[PDB]
Amino acid sequence: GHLEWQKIAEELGTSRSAFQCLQKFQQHNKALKRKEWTEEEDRMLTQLVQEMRVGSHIPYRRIVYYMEGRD
């Protein structure tokens, strides 16, 4: 279930640890790197942009702290 990555590393059998396995998976996890879009992400992105943006300047990536699976 993408959980207990110590067990995942042990099952891998190449002497990897949980942290390395998780790092590699997250760097190649479609669920994390959101090529997709969701309604709540769009709504909250619009809300934060409208709250903060002045003129043509918006906090393009500082919104990522609030919305998951982004950069």
Residues forming the site for DNA (CB under 7 A): 27, 32-35, 37, 42, 45, 49, 58, 60-61, 64, 69-71
Tokens for 50, please give them: 């409208």
**Which residue, 6 or 46, has its beta carbon nearer to DNA?**
46
**Which residue, 3 or 28, has its beta carbon nearer to DNA?**
28
Contact indicator for 44, 53 with CB cutoff of 8 Å: no
CB of 59 to DNA, least distance (A): 9
CB of 49 to DNA, least distance (A): 7
Measured CA angle at 38 (ends 37, 42), to 5 deg: 90
Q: Label residue 5 left, alpha or beta by phi (over 0 means left) and psi (-120 to 50 means alpha).
A: alpha
